[PDB]
């Protein structure tokens, strides 16, 4: 009843399941930036990088080598920036290798589309890391994970 063939195609290597083809799943996936409609590859990259560079600062800030120092947050931001640069390089090389120069009109599966996506991802990631750095440096609750209220 709940599990069925994918797209009514019994011989495709997939099954239609609640996790895979439910209404909530479809809405969530179709509203994520990687799939939302109307966004340019640049805007997709911007949103995704913003979201990712934010979470990156914390692990580095609170568990890095200079975590028990007075420069822990700056060190964390710096290490996030380095990782963001490495991942932007990965994105760029993947784009140049995978996508040939034929023009499919910026569909995120084109050379131009992926270039825009990686540029937006770099900008948004650096911006999000900086925003997280500002918020952590200025709010005590984030520097102590709530152990200021104790």
């Amino acid at each position: 009843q709940f599990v069925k063939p994918y797209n009514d195609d019994p011989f495709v290597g997939n099954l239609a399941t609640p996790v895979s083809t439910s209404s909530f799943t479809r809405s969530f996936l179709s509203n994520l930036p990687a799939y939302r409609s109307g966004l340019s590859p640049l805007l997709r990259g911007l949103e995704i990088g913003m979201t990712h560079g934010y979470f990156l600062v914390g692990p580095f800030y609170k568990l890095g080598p200079l975590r028990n120092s007075d420069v822990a947050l700056i060190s964390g931001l710096f290490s996030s920036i380095g990782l963001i640069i490495i991942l932007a390089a990965c994105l760029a090389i993947y784009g140049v290798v995978s996508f040939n120069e034929d023009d499919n009109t910026d569909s995120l599966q084109t050379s131009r589309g992926w270039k825009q996506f990686t540029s937006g991802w770099l900008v948004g990631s650096i911006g999000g890391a900086s925003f997280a750095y500002i918020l952590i440096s200025n709010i005590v609750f984030l520097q102590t994970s709530g152990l200021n209220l104790i």
């Binding site: 994918y6 797209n7 399941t17 083809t21 439910s22």
Partner: protein, 99 residues
């Protein structure tokens, strides 16, 4: 709401309410054991929630009856929720499959 590609699901919250009451009203059955105090499972859970809200940021210490009461109450609640959704959707008023 579609639980799958084309399968619809009611998702009635009254099922949740009924299952919650079905597990919680029996939970009122008091016990004089130290864990419950003198009270039942649901009442003990409410009392612990209030007691540890008074001391908000500090968590209930390991060994506090709060953790055991929480675990038992939620185990029973989830069991009753599963059984209630099964009854409402398979044995309910609009089920098709003879279960």
């Amino acid at each position: 709401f579609e639980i799958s590609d084309g399968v619809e699901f009611d998702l009635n919250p009254l099922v949740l309410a009924i299952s919650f009451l079905g597990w919680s009203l029996p939970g009122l059955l008091p016990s004089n054991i130290p864990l419950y105090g003198g009270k039942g499972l649901t009442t003990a859970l409410f009392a612990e929630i209030g007691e540890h809200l008074q001391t908000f940021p500090a968590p209930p210490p390991i060994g506090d009856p709060f953790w055991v009461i929480l675990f038992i109450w939620h185990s029973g609640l989830f069991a009753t929720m599963i059984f209630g959704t099964i009854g409402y959707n398979g044995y309910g008023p609009k089920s098709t499959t003879k279960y």
